[PDB]
Amino acid sequence: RELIRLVSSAGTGHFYTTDKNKRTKPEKIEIKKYDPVVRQHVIYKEAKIK
RNA sequence: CCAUAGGUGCAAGAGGCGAACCAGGGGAACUGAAACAUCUAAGUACCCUGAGGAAAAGAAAUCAACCGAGAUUCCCUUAG
RNA sequence: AAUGGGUCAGCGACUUAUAUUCAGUGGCAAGCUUAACCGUAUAGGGUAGGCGUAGCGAAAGCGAGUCUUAAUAGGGCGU
RNA sequence: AACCCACUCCCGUUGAAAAGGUAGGGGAUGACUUGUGGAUCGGAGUGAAAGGCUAAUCAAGCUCGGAGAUAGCUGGUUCUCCUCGAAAGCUAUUUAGGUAGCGCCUCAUGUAUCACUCUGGGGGGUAGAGCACUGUUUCGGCUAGGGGGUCAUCCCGACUUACCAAACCGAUGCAAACUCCGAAUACCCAGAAGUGAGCAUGGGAGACACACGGCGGGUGCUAACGUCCGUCGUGAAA
RNA sequence: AUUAAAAACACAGCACUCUGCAAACACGAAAGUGGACGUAUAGGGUGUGACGCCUGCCCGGUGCCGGAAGGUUAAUUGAUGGGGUUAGCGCAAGCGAAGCUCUUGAUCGAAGCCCCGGUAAACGGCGGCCGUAACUAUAACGGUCCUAAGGUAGCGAAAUU
RNA sequence: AUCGCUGUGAAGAUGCAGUGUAUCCGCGGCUAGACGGAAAGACCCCGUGAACCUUUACUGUAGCUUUGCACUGGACUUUGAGCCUGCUUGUGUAGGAUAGGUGGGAGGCUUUGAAGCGUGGACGCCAGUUCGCGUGGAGCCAUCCUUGAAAUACCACCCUGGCAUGCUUGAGGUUCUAACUCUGGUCCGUAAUCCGGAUCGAGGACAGUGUAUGGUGGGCAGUUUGACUGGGGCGGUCUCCUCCUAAAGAGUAACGGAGGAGUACGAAGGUGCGCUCAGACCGGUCGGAAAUCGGUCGCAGAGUAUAAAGGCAAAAGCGCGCUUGACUGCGAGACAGACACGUCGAGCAGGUACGAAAGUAGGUCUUAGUGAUCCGGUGGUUCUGUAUGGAAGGGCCAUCGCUCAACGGAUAAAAGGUACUCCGGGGAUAACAGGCUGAUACCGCCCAAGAGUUCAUAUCGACGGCGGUGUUUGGCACCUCGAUGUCGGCUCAUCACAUCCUGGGGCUGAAGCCGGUCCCAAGGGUAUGGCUGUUCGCCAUUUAAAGUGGUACGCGAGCUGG
RNA sequence: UUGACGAUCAUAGAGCGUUGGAACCACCUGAUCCCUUCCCGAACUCAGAAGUGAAACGACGCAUCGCCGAUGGUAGUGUGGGGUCUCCCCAUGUGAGAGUAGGUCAUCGUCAAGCU
């Protein structure tokens, strides 16, 4: 369960942080979650915390 | 070879001692940290070299903010 | 049947200084008080400085309110 | 033999002596003994090496300074009276014989006679008891069972039932880590009568080595004035 | 020196190794002195200890000696990139020259180690399992297992059993 | 104003309780006691004590050694590299050749391109190319003449193979003298050969010395090396979860009995819609005790991501469709609790996913799956920004890297010895003796299967039970660490009786001599030697017999010291 | 005569036996059309009766299993005192579990609907 970052779609540097078992599923996820700057839901994506 | 070293003759000064004080040279450890290596203790103890009745330091290639203050030395605050 | 003391007479152990907190008793009182230093010197001057009379906030800042927050909602601290 | 040395016994141990004495021993022309004078020094000398000697001191002298070193460790702490009066528990610790917060004592300030001791509602799974579950146990029956004898078939039937043995019916016992059940007490909150001290903020501490006894328990050999807990009492401090 | 006189220390003898002279080595902040007014038949260090018969195998570990091919490897150099300021330009937003600076670090760098060999009178190390011969118990002989190699001569209930 | 004995008692009494004895006071002897006198125990444990030793503990250093920069020069050379210049070099499909090319030039008239055969050169992604033209001052490639991705002949810019030589510079090699060196020779100061100075001789840009840096370095130094512990050493254990001990509220110990964690999951989460287990049995193709299918009986005996406990029909269990509420700002109230951390949460506002709509969703049936502060690293952030304007550096918000796991974590960074030892303490704690206790011991006693030819009890007595003594192997840790001297021998002893000898005596498998066994009896006796430190033992020889225990395993202010 | 929704959770359960239609209810017919099946009109759904009370469902009977369950005694236990003291006894307050006598084939409420 390596840990990953989920950078927002819009311009803001707001992100979420979670973990993902890299070994079983290699591809990235596109979860739609809330954004505290634009005050509405957008979709997120990334990995690679550093 | 010249002429310096070197050697004599004279004049003037210094050398040694003393309790603390002052400026430089060299400079510990115990102990604190409830252990201990950075750090403290501490440039303190002690040890040398100078000088004076005091010494050192001093007359801006300094501080302040767009206002200004004009050498150093010492006490009281800023302030634990 | 653990320690100490042969008996007598002398001496022999919670102190000081500088900061600060709480109580007791006093002075002036939204104000109280001066340190060095001057001084015919225990008087007098000296109010620089300190504590108070208003807070909240990491800060700028705003103020009987202010901070967080999209907040004008709630809530923390304060009157 | 002088001389240098120190192998044995006894005496001495407040000695005559802070290392001797009386008897006996080893070397005694040499790696000898010794007189005078000099040289080597403190993490430093010397040493045919024992950690030996360096002024009766040596796994690093003696003396004066740093220095009234540091000591959760021992010992001691001095005149009278009056009111109140403990603890040897918990949590953490390079901690266990130290210390710090809460529990227990004291003196002030406040709010509350709060709050105790008597009577109404309330959960529980302990002693006991039980076998419905989980296990364990005895006998009897009826059997599955597989069979045990096996009648016994190249090799098949099934006689028999000598094997044993599920499972199921009936009687019968037992569990801290088993429950269809199930008290006494202890806890909570409410109601009142009488008699006699709760909460909160401040100052000051001491304690944190416990002892026995009764009633419930672990461990031990249901042994110890053994040892670790729960609760009441007495010592400590009568 | 003052509870231990020995089997302890010494020793003549033996071997190993370092030292070509302003020597190795020691004491000294340094000057210098010992060594030694000596010169490898000499001088330092380490072990064993007259004499007699002798001194076996293991170079993996650790140390010293020998070798450089290649790898890594120090300050020293500072290529390149990225960033600060601003002359300019832009309604603004922003891009931005030269200078000056702040980081980044390419190369350039020796011994050393890693490697490759030698040395055990250098520190050190020298195994197990079974089955086996006309009594045949026993094991000459035979398997197998592991290692850098698996204890020979001599001695043996011993200052060790 | 100082007796004995039996008890008690912080547990071995001249001083307590009970009861026996004793007229007051000396002198010579002896050493049983006064836990006798001397020495803050050295053995043993502790102290976040001290010394000095060891190494492969950690951090360093003396010393030795490598290379930069100084002191420090020229002469040639090999070789790297920058520099220059003029640059003349430029060969593949294919053009006549040849493409590094960008602008002028359409052709090019300096022997026109002299040609053209062949002249050498060096040349070659080779016959491909440049320069002499042998002749001789003689037309050429064709300027798209071609074709080729760009056409020549001519002027310009640069680059390349390199050509040369320069400019600088590194690295290596040789040589030279003038720096430095000489613990060489002979003059001088000097009557000295230390030290200078003069001159020859040797070495020579090396050696050596400063300063910066690598390596080696117990040669040397400052230091570290945990706790609980039925003594501490060895071993085991240090944090979190569930059950039992735990006494029907919470809580609650032991080196007390049993087990588990240091994670998984983008669906194993949300929501709507549906649906029920294991087992028993009988029927049924190659399975076959047991696969799939059908059926009746069931009444949770299954299941639950992961240990056990408590649960689960609105099923918290199973399937399918859409999805992201595994959301942001909060949070009245409480439960727990030394503190720091902790657990549950209605409701409000933002924006969402299901469902026709009420409504449900702030992760998973619940409880384990984890580590403060300081550091530093990365995204947002005007909040600050030391004259001013900016920046660097702070601050706040979000998030990453600790296993002294000794899990409230001493530091970025740590092992051992002491019989050479030392200081401060302790019977809060061990070894000797005492004390309480008897599992172990040793002495008995109850049932009696049996053998003893027959016959259980003349002698033994398996299987099992109930006691006594404190004698040895223990258990515990109450006394003593400002000292209670431990084993064997010598000397001297005293008491018990569970009797070795002698005395009296039931029974006998006792003919006689001898015996075996058990009751009564403590008066007197109760061996010399060999071997060992021995008590013990094993031997040789005796004797009426060579007893078993207590008395700090009697007895060191009585001796010895194996 | 029934049908819906509750109240109370076995003295309300299980088993056996009997019995009810054309009002209700259930089976039933067909899936064309809504709609459905990891295959199937089984279930789900739609248009619908004929036919039937068989099944199912309700009522009415049986204590055969189950379930409730007295009284008396007994176990244990709070406080005070005892004794022969790893266990019990006395005074006093409290008092099960198991078993016995026996019980149980439920009792209600709201509407629509059947004398009603």
Coordinates of C-alpha atoms (C1' of nucleotides) in Angstrom, one line a residue, chain F residues 19-335:
Chain F
rU19 C1' 9.7 -22.0 90.6
rG20 C1' 14.3 -23.8 93.0
rU21 C1' 18.7 -22.6 95.5
rA22 C1' 22.6 -18.6 98.1
rU23 C1' 25.6 -15.6 105.3
rC24 C1' 29.1 -10.6 103.9
rC25 C1' 34.5 -10.0 101.5
rG26 C1' 39.3 -11.6 99.4
rC27 C1' 43.6 -14.4 97.2
rG28 C1' 45.9 -18.4 93.5
rG29 C1' 44.3 -21.4 88.8
rC30 C1' 41.2 -22.4 84.3
rU31 C1' 38.7 -20.1 80.0
rA32 C1' 32.2 -22.1 79.2
rG33 C1' 29.4 -17.2 78.6
rA34 C1' 29.0 -11.6 78.8
rC35 C1' 26.4 -12.8 70.3
rG36 C1' 34.0 -10.8 75.1
rG37 C1' 38.3 -6.3 73.1
rA38 C1' 40.6 -4.4 68.4
rA39 C1' 39.1 -2.8 62.9
rA40 C1' 32.0 2.2 59.8
rG41 C1' 33.1 -6.3 56.6
rA42 C1' 37.2 -7.4 52.2
rC43 C1' 32.7 -12.4 50.5
rC44 C1' 27.5 -10.7 48.5
rC45 C1' 24.3 -6.8 46.5
rC46 C1' 23.5 -1.8 45.3
rG47 C1' 25.3 3.9 43.6
rU48 C1' 22.5 6.6 36.2
rG49 C1' 29.9 5.8 42.1
rA50 C1' 36.2 6.1 41.3
rA51 C1' 40.4 4.1 39.4
rC52 C1' 43.6 1.5 36.0
rC53 C1' 43.9 -2.3 32.2
rU54 C1' 41.8 -4.8 27.1
rU55 C1' 39.9 -4.7 22.1
rU56 C1' 37.2 -5.7 16.2
rA57 C1' 32.8 -0.4 21.7
rC58 C1' 32.1 5.1 19.9
rU59 C1' 34.3 9.8 19.1
rG60 C1' 38.9 11.7 18.4
rU61 C1' 44.1 12.7 18.3
rA62 C1' 50.5 12.0 18.5
rG63 C1' 53.3 9.9 14.9
rC64 C1' 54.0 8.0 9.8
rU65 C1' 52.5 8.7 4.8
rU66 C1' 49.9 10.6 -0.6
rU67 C1' 48.8 14.8 -3.4
rG68 C1' 47.8 20.6 -4.4
rC69 C1' 50.0 25.9 -3.5
rA70 C1' 54.7 28.5 -1.7
rC71 C1' 60.3 28.7 -1.3
rU72 C1' 61.4 27.5 -7.4
rG73 C1' 64.9 28.3 -12.2
rG74 C1' 66.2 27.4 -18.6
rA75 C1' 67.2 24.1 -22.5
rC76 C1' 65.3 20.8 -25.9
rU77 C1' 61.6 17.1 -26.3
rU78 C1' 57.0 13.5 -26.4
rU79 C1' 51.7 14.7 -25.8
rG80 C1' 46.5 17.0 -24.5
rA81 C1' 44.2 21.0 -25.3
rG82 C1' 42.5 25.6 -26.5
rC83 C1' 44.3 30.0 -30.7
rC84 C1' 45.4 31.8 -35.6
rU85 C1' 45.6 32.2 -40.5
rG86 C1' 45.0 31.1 -45.7
rC87 C1' 42.5 27.9 -45.5
rU88 C1' 43.5 24.7 -50.4
rU89 C1' 40.1 19.2 -48.5
rG90 C1' 33.7 18.1 -49.4
rU91 C1' 33.9 11.0 -53.4
rG92 C1' 26.7 7.3 -51.0
rU93 C1' 20.3 6.8 -55.4
rA94 C1' 22.4 9.7 -59.5
rG95 C1' 24.6 14.4 -62.6
rG96 C1' 29.8 14.6 -66.9
rA97 C1' 32.1 15.4 -61.0
rU98 C1' 31.5 16.6 -56.1
rA99 C1' 27.3 18.2 -52.2
rG100 C1' 28.4 21.0 -45.1
rG101 C1' 26.3 24.8 -46.9
rU102 C1' 23.4 30.6 -46.9
rG103 C1' 23.8 35.5 -50.7
rG104 C1' 26.0 37.4 -55.8
rG105 C1' 27.0 34.8 -60.4
rA106 C1' 24.2 32.3 -65.8
rG107 C1' 28.1 30.9 -67.7
rG108 C1' 32.2 32.5 -67.1
rC109 C1' 37.4 36.3 -72.4
rU110 C1' 44.4 36.1 -66.9
rU111 C1' 47.9 31.7 -71.5
rU112 C1' 40.0 32.0 -73.5
rG113 C1' 39.1 26.5 -69.8
rA114 C1' 44.4 25.9 -74.7
rA115 C1' 42.9 22.6 -75.7
rG116 C1' 43.3 17.0 -76.5
rC117 C1' 46.4 12.0 -75.8
rG118 C1' 48.9 11.3 -72.2
rU119 C1' 53.5 14.2 -67.9
rG120 C1' 54.4 13.4 -61.7
rG121 C1' 52.3 14.5 -57.4
rA122 C1' 49.7 13.4 -53.4
rC123 C1' 46.0 11.8 -53.0
rG124 C1' 40.6 8.5 -53.3
rC125 C1' 32.1 6.7 -49.3
rC126 C1' 38.8 4.9 -56.1
rA127 C1' 40.1 4.8 -61.3
rG128 C1' 36.7 9.7 -57.8
rU129 C1' 39.7 14.8 -57.2
rU130 C1' 43.3 18.9 -57.2
rC131 C1' 47.5 21.3 -59.0
rG132 C1' 52.9 21.0 -64.1
rC133 C1' 50.5 21.3 -68.8
rG134 C1' 55.3 17.0 -72.2
rU135 C1' 53.8 19.6 -76.7
rG136 C1' 52.9 23.9 -77.1
rG137 C1' 50.6 29.8 -75.1
rA138 C1' 46.4 25.4 -78.9
rG139 C1' 38.5 25.8 -76.2
rC140 C1' 36.4 24.2 -72.6
rC141 C1' 32.2 20.7 -67.4
rA142 C1' 27.7 23.6 -70.6
rU143 C1' 26.3 28.5 -68.1
rC144 C1' 19.4 22.4 -67.1
rC145 C1' 23.8 20.5 -71.7
rU146 C1' 22.2 17.2 -68.4
rU147 C1' 20.2 14.5 -64.9
rG148 C1' 20.2 14.8 -59.7
rA149 C1' 16.0 16.5 -53.5
rA150 C1' 20.3 21.6 -54.1
rA151 C1' 24.4 22.6 -61.1
rU152 C1' 28.6 23.7 -62.3
rA153 C1' 32.5 28.7 -64.6
rC154 C1' 33.4 32.1 -61.6
rC155 C1' 33.3 36.5 -55.6
rA156 C1' 31.8 36.4 -50.6
rC157 C1' 31.2 34.2 -45.3
rC158 C1' 32.4 30.5 -42.1
rC159 C1' 33.5 24.6 -40.8
rU160 C1' 36.1 20.0 -41.6
rG161 C1' 40.4 16.2 -42.8
rG162 C1' 44.1 18.3 -41.3
rC163 C1' 48.8 21.3 -43.6
rA164 C1' 51.9 23.6 -41.6
rU165 C1' 53.9 27.8 -37.4
rG166 C1' 52.7 30.8 -34.2
rC167 C1' 50.3 32.3 -29.9
rU168 C1' 49.4 30.5 -25.0
rU169 C1' 48.7 25.3 -21.2
rG170 C1' 48.6 21.1 -19.1
rA171 C1' 51.2 15.9 -18.4
rG172 C1' 55.7 13.1 -19.2
rG173 C1' 61.3 12.6 -20.6
rU174 C1' 66.4 14.3 -20.6
rU175 C1' 70.1 17.8 -19.5
rC176 C1' 72.2 22.5 -17.3
rU177 C1' 73.5 25.8 -12.9
rA178 C1' 72.2 30.3 -10.2
rA179 C1' 68.3 29.1 -5.7
rC180 C1' 68.4 25.9 -1.5
rU181 C1' 71.6 21.6 0.8
rC182 C1' 76.3 19.3 2.7
rU183 C1' 76.6 15.5 10.6
rG184 C1' 83.0 17.1 2.9
rG185 C1' 88.1 19.2 2.4
rU186 C1' 91.8 24.0 3.8
rC187 C1' 92.1 29.3 5.1
rC188 C1' 90.3 33.3 8.5
rG189 C1' 88.0 35.2 13.1
rU190 C1' 91.1 32.1 17.2
rA191 C1' 95.2 30.3 21.5
rA192 C1' 88.5 27.0 20.2
rU193 C1' 86.7 24.0 14.6
rC194 C1' 80.8 25.2 18.5
rC195 C1' 79.3 29.1 15.3
rG196 C1' 80.1 32.2 11.3
rG197 C1' 82.6 34.2 6.7
rA198 C1' 85.6 33.2 2.3
rU199 C1' 86.9 29.5 -1.7
rC200 C1' 87.0 25.2 -4.2
rG201 C1' 84.0 19.5 -4.3
rA202 C1' 79.4 16.8 -4.3
rG203 C1' 74.0 16.7 -4.9
rG204 C1' 70.4 20.0 -7.5
rA205 C1' 65.1 22.2 -8.9
rC206 C1' 65.0 16.9 -6.1
rA207 C1' 65.5 16.9 -0.7
rG208 C1' 63.5 19.7 3.1
rU209 C1' 60.0 23.2 5.6
rG210 C1' 55.1 26.1 6.1
rU211 C1' 49.7 25.8 4.9
rA212 C1' 45.0 22.9 2.7
rU213 C1' 43.7 17.7 2.1
rG214 C1' 43.3 11.9 1.8
rG215 C1' 45.0 7.2 4.4
rU216 C1' 47.0 4.4 8.5
rG217 C1' 47.0 5.0 13.7
rG218 C1' 44.6 1.3 21.7
rG219 C1' 51.0 4.7 20.2
rC220 C1' 47.5 8.1 23.5
rA221 C1' 43.1 10.5 25.9
rG222 C1' 37.9 11.4 27.3
rU223 C1' 34.0 8.2 27.9
rU224 C1' 29.7 4.6 27.3
rU225 C1' 28.2 -0.8 28.4
rG226 C1' 19.5 -0.5 30.9
rA227 C1' 15.7 -2.6 34.0
rC228 C1' 12.1 -6.4 36.3
rU229 C1' 14.4 -10.8 39.1
rG230 C1' 10.7 -15.4 45.9
rG231 C1' 19.9 -13.2 46.3
rG232 C1' 21.9 -11.8 40.7
rG233 C1' 24.4 -14.5 37.0
rC234 C1' 22.2 -17.5 32.7
rG235 C1' 17.5 -17.7 30.3
rG236 C1' 12.6 -15.2 29.6
rU237 C1' 10.2 -10.4 29.3
rC238 C1' 9.5 -4.4 28.0
rU239 C1' 3.9 -1.8 23.2
rC240 C1' -1.3 -2.8 21.6
rC241 C1' -6.3 -6.7 21.4
rU242 C1' -9.9 -10.8 23.4
rC243 C1' -11.0 -14.4 27.4
rC244 C1' -10.1 -16.3 32.8
rU245 C1' -8.3 -15.0 37.8
rA246 C1' -12.2 -10.5 39.2
rA247 C1' -15.9 -11.4 44.7
rA248 C1' -23.8 -10.4 39.5
rG249 C1' -21.9 -1.7 38.7
rA250 C1' -16.5 0.5 37.1
rG251 C1' -11.7 -0.8 38.6
rU252 C1' -7.9 -4.4 40.6
rA253 C1' -1.8 -7.9 41.2
rA254 C1' 1.7 -12.4 40.4
rC255 C1' 8.6 -14.8 36.2
rG256 C1' -0.6 -16.8 37.3
rG257 C1' -3.4 -20.1 33.3
rA258 C1' -4.8 -19.7 27.4
rG259 C1' -4.4 -17.2 22.5
rG260 C1' -3.6 -13.1 18.6
rA261 C1' -1.8 -8.1 15.9
rG262 C1' 3.0 -4.1 13.7
rU263 C1' -2.4 -5.3 8.1
rA264 C1' -5.9 -5.7 3.9
rC265 C1' -10.0 -3.3 0.3
rG266 C1' -11.3 1.8 -5.3
rA267 C1' -14.9 -2.6 -3.8
rA268 C1' -14.5 -6.3 0.7
rG269 C1' -17.2 1.4 0.7
rG270 C1' -22.7 4.2 -0.5
rU271 C1' -27.7 3.1 -2.2
rG272 C1' -31.9 0.9 -4.3
rC273 C1' -33.9 -3.8 -5.6
rG274 C1' -34.1 -8.9 -4.8
rC275 C1' -32.7 -13.9 -1.8
rU276 C1' -31.7 -17.5 2.4
rC277 C1' -27.8 -21.7 6.0
rA278 C1' -25.1 -26.2 7.5
rG279 C1' -26.3 -30.7 7.6
rA280 C1' -29.8 -35.8 7.3
rC281 C1' -31.6 -38.4 4.2
rC282 C1' -33.9 -41.3 -0.9
rG283 C1' -33.5 -40.8 -6.8
rG284 C1' -30.1 -40.0 -10.4
rU285 C1' -24.6 -41.0 -16.8
rC286 C1' -18.0 -42.6 -16.5
rG287 C1' -17.2 -39.1 -9.6
rG288 C1' -19.0 -41.8 -5.8
rA289 C1' -17.8 -42.3 2.0
rA290 C1' -18.4 -37.4 -0.5
rA291 C1' -18.6 -32.8 -7.1
rU292 C1' -23.2 -31.2 -10.3
rC293 C1' -29.1 -31.9 -10.5
rG294 C1' -34.4 -33.2 -7.9
rG295 C1' -36.6 -33.8 -4.1
rU296 C1' -38.6 -34.0 1.2
rC297 C1' -36.7 -32.9 6.6
rG298 C1' -34.6 -28.3 8.5
rC299 C1' -36.0 -24.4 12.4
rA300 C1' -28.6 -21.0 12.6
rG301 C1' -26.2 -26.7 14.7
rA302 C1' -23.7 -22.3 8.6
rG303 C1' -21.7 -17.5 7.4
rU304 C1' -18.7 -12.7 9.5
rA305 C1' -11.4 -10.4 4.9
rU306 C1' -8.4 -11.3 9.7
rA307 C1' -7.6 -14.1 17.3
rA308 C1' -11.2 -14.8 20.8
rA309 C1' -15.5 -12.5 23.1
rG310 C1' -20.2 -10.0 22.6
rG311 C1' -23.6 -10.0 18.6
rC312 C1' -26.8 -10.5 13.7
rA313 C1' -34.8 -11.4 10.0
rA314 C1' -35.4 -3.8 9.1
rA315 C1' -30.9 -10.1 8.7
rA316 C1' -24.7 -6.7 10.3
rG317 C1' -24.9 -13.2 6.0
rC318 C1' -25.6 -13.7 -0.2
rG319 C1' -26.5 -11.6 -5.4
rC320 C1' -27.4 -7.6 -9.3
rG321 C1' -27.8 -2.0 -11.2
rC322 C1' -26.0 3.0 -10.7
rU323 C1' -21.9 5.5 -8.0
rU324 C1' -18.0 8.2 -4.9
rG325 C1' -20.9 10.8 1.7
rA326 C1' -13.2 6.6 2.3
rC327 C1' -16.9 14.7 1.5
rU328 C1' -15.2 20.9 3.4
rG329 C1' -16.5 24.4 7.7
rC330 C1' -18.5 22.9 12.4
rG331 C1' -20.5 20.8 16.7
rA332 C1' -25.0 21.3 22.0
rG333 C1' -24.0 17.5 25.0
rA334 C1' -21.7 13.7 27.5
rC335 C1' -18.6 9.1 28.6

